[PDB]
Scaffold this active site. Structure first.
Site, mmCIF file in Angstrom:
data_model
loop_
_atom_site.group_PDB
_atom_site.id
_atom_site.type_symbol
_atom_site.label_atom_id
_atom_site.label_comp_id
_atom_site.label_asym_id
_atom_site.label_seq_id
_atom_site.Cartn_x
_atom_site.Cartn_y
_atom_site.Cartn_z
ATOM 1 N N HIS A 42 0.805 -1.222 0.000
ATOM 2 C CA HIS A 42 0.000 0.000 0.000
ATOM 3 C C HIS A 42 0.840 1.274 0.000
ATOM 4 O O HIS A 42 0.314 2.381 -0.156
ATOM 5 C CB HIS A 42 -0.990 0.022 1.184
ATOM 6 C CG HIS A 42 -0.393 0.463 2.486
ATOM 7 N ND1 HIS A 42 0.015 -0.424 3.458
ATOM 8 C CD2 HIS A 42 -0.130 1.699 2.973
ATOM 9 C CE1 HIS A 42 0.506 0.245 4.486
ATOM 10 N NE2 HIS A 42 0.429 1.535 4.217
ATOM 11 N N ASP A 88 -0.178 -7.291 2.161
ATOM 12 C CA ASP A 88 0.460 -5.973 2.160
ATOM 13 C C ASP A 88 1.983 -6.167 2.258
ATOM 14 O O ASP A 88 2.596 -6.063 3.336
ATOM 15 C CB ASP A 88 -0.068 -5.131 3.332
ATOM 16 C CG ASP A 88 0.246 -3.640 3.181
ATOM 17 O OD1 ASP A 88 0.653 -3.200 2.077
ATOM 18 O OD2 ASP A 88 0.068 -2.904 4.175
ATOM 19 N N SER A 185 4.559 2.916 8.081
ATOM 20 C CA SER A 185 4.121 1.873 7.159
ATOM 21 C C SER A 185 5.261 1.416 6.254
ATOM 22 O O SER A 185 6.071 2.228 5.814
ATOM 23 C CB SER A 185 2.966 2.394 6.296
ATOM 24 O OG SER A 185 1.847 2.720 7.102
ATOM 25 N N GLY A 186 5.314 0.114 5.976
ATOM 26 C CA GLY A 186 6.366 -0.429 5.132
ATOM 27 C C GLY A 186 7.629 -0.720 5.932
ATOM 28 O O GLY A 186 8.492 -1.491 5.503
#
Ligand SMILES: CO[C@@H]1C[C@H](C(=O)Nc2ccc(-n3ccccc3=O)cc2F)N(C(=O)Nc2ccc(Cl)cc2)C1
Ligand SMILES: [Ca+2]
Lengths: 234, 51
Positions: A42, A88, A185-186
């Site tokens: 994402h 994800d 995120s990530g």
């Protein structure tokens, strides 16, 4: 990261930062090897074009250790969909090899069963990033890290207003004000074993941040080792 | 038993022929005692950096 502590010198060498063409960070990533970075799927739709930064601990300046690397290939898991946020995960092949040094080194990829029976069963994991320090805050300028307890799987589903899949896992606190956030995120969720850190999760999502009765949702890395191994050969 | 303190392995542990066989992540070689994992070069994966 909400709460936790500052990443001291040499403490989070595997941390990677995705920066937009404006050189602003927007997502984390984890160094796997001199050519590969592991991040969240994402995070891709989140930027027209982007580069990866390594060795950075404070975005306000250049201390000399930082290094920029352009992306050559973006391997997004085809099954990823924003409607469920399942799958994800994404792998990046860099155009130029990373130079390992102080604050720049890869995290270890473990083996499925071993990680599940030994790493995932640990008391805590470690998440890090330059993300917001509050739900409604701004992009943190300092790299942070946070020890996050592994959460019961049932206790994880009972608290989520969304579906928690087998490719997901909970980590965090029920009420204590600490958790990852937007911007993280990530990023890497690593678990330590005899002073060696293995990547166990990818910072994925959460209903807010540090919210009482909520946890951080991470992509289970063990569920994609094969996919990751296949992604790194091409 | 890989169940007992991890069969004294530094990293990966398997149970073949009803015993214990240690192994390491890429970048490490299995030491002589077949338990410890020795770093192949500077900056091995999984180690916080000091220099
Ligand atoms: C309200 O939230 C803000 C906004 C941002 C966000 O958009 N989150 C977000 C993403 C996807 C879903 N989602 C899940 C399943 C099915 C459909 C679906 O839409 C729900 C969400 F709330 N956010 C966040 O990413 N926090 C965060 C917290 C902890 C950790 Cl480890 C990592 C990130 C906090
Ligand atoms: Ca800097």
């Amino acid at each position: 990261i909400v709460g936790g502590q500052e990443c001291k010198d040499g403490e989070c060498p595997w941390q990677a930062l995705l920066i937009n063409e404006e050189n602003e960070g927007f997502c984390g990533g984890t160094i796997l090897s001199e050519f590969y970075i592991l991040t969240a799927a994402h995070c891709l739709y989140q930027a027209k074009r982007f580069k990866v930064r390594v060795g950075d601990r404070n975005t306000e300046q250049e201390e000399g250790g930082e290094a920029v690397h352009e992306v050559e290939v973006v391997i997004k898991h085809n099954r990823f969909t924003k409607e469920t946020y399942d799958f994800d995960i994404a792998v990046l092949r860099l155009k130029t090899p990373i130079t390992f040094r102080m604050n720049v080194a890869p995290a270890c990829l473990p083996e499925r069963d071993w990680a599940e029976s030994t790493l995932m069963t640990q008391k805590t994991g470690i998440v890090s990033g330059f993300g917001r320090t509050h739900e409604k805050g701004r992009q943190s300028t300092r790299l942070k890290m946070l020890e996050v307890p592994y959460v019961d799987r049932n206790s994880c589903k009972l608290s989520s207003s969304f579906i928690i899949t087998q490719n997901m896992f909970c980590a965090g606190y029920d009420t204590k004000q600490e958790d990852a956030c937007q911007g993280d995120s990530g990023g890497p969720h690593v678990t330590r074993f005899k002073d060696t850190y293995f990547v166990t999760g990818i910072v994925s999502w959460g209903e807010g941040c540090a919210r009482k009765g909520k946890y951080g949702i991470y992509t289970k890395v063990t569920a994609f080792l094969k996919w990751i191994d296949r992604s790194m050969k091409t | 038993l890989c169940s007992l303190d991890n069969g004294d392995c530094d990293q990966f542990c398997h149970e073949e022929q009803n015993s214990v066989v240690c192994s390491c992540a890429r970048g490490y070689t299995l030491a002589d005692n077949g338990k410890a994992c020795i770093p192949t070069g500077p900056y091995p994966c999984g180690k916080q950096t000091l220099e």
